[PDB]
Structure formats: C-alpha cells, structure tokens
C-alpha cells in the first residue's frame, strides 16, 4: 500500500492493498470501516482529456446495466461533495481475490479448471453479445477470479455497441481488426477468447507479437495463411490484401500434434475460435454448446441479454466533440442515478 496512492474518499474507508496501477485506472482493496466489508475501489482521473472521460462513462454505464454472475458487480460510485471539487471517479465493486493472468502465471490448472474458466468467460460474452455489446479488450487480466473459481469479466470502457484512443493489447486482437478498418464485431471477442483458451492450455500467450508484422506472422503460422480469393473475401483494403499475399504460405498447424496432452475436445473448440474468417468463427452461444464444455452447459441458465441501442453511447457520435465539462456532467448523472 504505497503512500503515494491517494484516494479522495470518505475517511470511513481505509485502503488495504494496491491491486492494479495503470495510466487509466488504479485499483485497491479497502475496508469500509463502519460495516467491516472489504471492497475493491477503482480510481480514475477522467478530466485531463475527453478520451479518459469517455472510457470512464462507457465503463460505468456497462457496469450499471448488467446484473450477471460473470460480470463484476458494481456496488456504487462515490459521491463528490461538489461539482467544482469533482476531479476523480471512485467505482466501488465487489472485491475478487485475483485475476486470470496472475492465476495462469502462478498455478498449474487441471483440464477441469480450464473448462470451467473458459465456460464462465463465454457465458459473460454471450450476454454482452446478445445485448449488442462487444468488449474489445478481453484478456486474462480483465477476468477476475476467486478461490472457489468464480470468474467475472471487468474493464468495460473500450466496449462498443454494434451499429487518439486506448488500444487493446495486440496479442489478443483478431486478425481482421489488425488488418482492416473492419467494423469491430462479436467475432473479434470470440477470437480474444480463443487466445485466452490457448493461454490456459500453454500457460503463456499463444501469439506474443513484438509488433504488427510479427503478430500477423505468429497468427498465420498457426491458423494457416489465407490465399484464395475466397480466403480473402473479408478483406476489402487493397493494401491489406497485398500484405497478406507477401506472407510465407503457412498451412494450418496440427495443434493436436503440437500439444498432445491437451484434451482433444479442447483443441477442437480452440480451432473453431481461431478461424481467420470472422463469419466462420464459432459464436459464444455455439461455444457454450460445444462438447468440451458439456459438464457446465445449461441452455436454460445462460442469459442471452436484450439489445441495447447505439444511443446508449450517444456521446460518442456528436458532430461536434463533447467538451470535458459536457462529459463531467454525463458522468455526474450516472453517479447520482
């Protein structure tokens, strides 16, 4: 608990431990002394640039909207004592014990744990997708975990509604997104989930590219290089098509041979997630129905969600960009509702 970490919240809270620290968010566990409850508090300074406030607002609205076992629970947002003195946002959430990046880094997981963690991840993705929401930044550190193996997705500020920026880690980015201006889609999240499932099997990232070029080499070295015009149907950009054509002609790698001790049903699911053509990639609902996850699948207990209209993030579509003060008011409205 570094002394440098300062939270301008009620003295009823006593910070306990620093859980995460980045340019956008700082997350600490803290004890709410009056009740004894230990919670997680995510602090964000949203007002130096609109970009930060936009991420904050998307995050808060998505957290408040969903009530799902695999989406981290928001308890409340602290109330500033005045609009003039509102400089940081403090999101109070249910406290989880760790995250999946730390778990994969420190624990040997059985095939049963892997089934269970990817099942829960996909169950969260299914409700987001059925609500026309894509996360766009799925990776192990954004999957929160308790010792009983409960898993909940977090970090929703890069989400978008189907129909300078913070950029999702390239290691989990779908190839069509990296290649084209392609309208981000549900399939991009399924690709990231395939990278997560592979990371669970390998105990390391499957495509740790050093840069754009290396990322594509690593991806195609495993899924095979697209070469026929049909293979390239989803790539309109002439620059992108020529670049793919300049790559070595890799065949799809025989994953069952490379990783012979992995459950073959797990490899099959993984292969269906890491497909180049987004229209042929498995959906989250189909993945929950896959044989690898039969132990946990229940078609009557996998919430589909309800569509959210683009206007839910109307602030992202203004002819004239909203000002920081404009966004401060929209965030205030979420805190007090």
């Amino acid at each position: 608990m570094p002394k440098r970490i300062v939270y301008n919240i009620s003295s009823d809270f006593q910070l306990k431990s620093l859980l995460g620290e980045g340019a956008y968010g700082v997350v600490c566990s803290a004890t709410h002394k009056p009740t004894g409850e230990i919670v997680a508090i995510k602090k964000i300074e949203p007002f130096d640039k609109p970009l930060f406030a936009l991420r904050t607002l998307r995050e808060i609205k998505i957290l408040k909207h969903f009530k799902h076992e695999n989406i981290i629970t928001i308890f409340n947002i602290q109330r500033p004592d005045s609009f003039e003195n509102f400089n940081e946002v403090y999101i109070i959430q249910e406290l989880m014990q760790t995250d999946l990046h730390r778990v994969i880094s420190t624990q040997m997981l059985s095939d049963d744990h892997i089934q269970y963690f990817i099942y829960q991840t996909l169950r969260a993705v299914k409700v987001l997708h059925g609500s026309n929401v894509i996360h766009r930044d799925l990776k192990p550190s954004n999957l929160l975990i308790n010792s009983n193996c409960d898993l909940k997705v977090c970090d929703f500020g890069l989400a978008r509604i189907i129909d300078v920026e913070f950029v999702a880690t390239r290691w989990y980015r779908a190839p069509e997104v990296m290649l084209t201006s392609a309208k981000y889609s549900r399939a991009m999240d399924v690709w990231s989930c395939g990278c997560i499932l592979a990371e669970l099997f390998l105990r390391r990232p499957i495509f740790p590219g050093r840069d754009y070029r290396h990322q594509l080499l690593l991806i195609f070295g495993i899924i095979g290089t697209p070469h026929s015009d049909n293979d390239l149907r989803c790539i309109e950009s002439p620059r992108a098509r020529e670049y793919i054509k300049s790559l070595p002609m890799y065949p799809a790698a025989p994953l069952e041979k490379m990783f012979p001790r992995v459950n073959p049903k797990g490899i099959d699911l993984l292969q269906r997630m890491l497909v180049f053509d987004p229209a042929k990639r498995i959906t989250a609902k189909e993945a929950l129905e896959h044989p690898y996850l039969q132990t946990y699948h229940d078609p009557n207990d996998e919430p589909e969600g309800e569509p959210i209209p683009p206007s839910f993030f109307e602030f992202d579509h203004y002819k004239e960009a909203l000002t920081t003060k404009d966004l401060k008011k929209l965030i205030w409205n979420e805190i007090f509702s």
């Binding site: 014990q97 760790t98 778990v103 624990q107 059985s110 049963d112 744990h113 269970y116 975990i145 010792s147 009983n148 193996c149 132990t295 946990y296 229940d298 207990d301």
Partner: peptide, 12 residues
C-alpha cells in the same frame, strides 16, 4: 452453482 467438482485454487 455448477462447480460440481468443487474446483478450487489455493490462493493466499
């Protein structure tokens, strides 16, 4: 609810 096998992680 469906953690049939009582899966757990020894986390400290």
């Amino acid at each position: 609810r469906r953690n049939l096998k009582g899966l757990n992680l020894n986390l400290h």
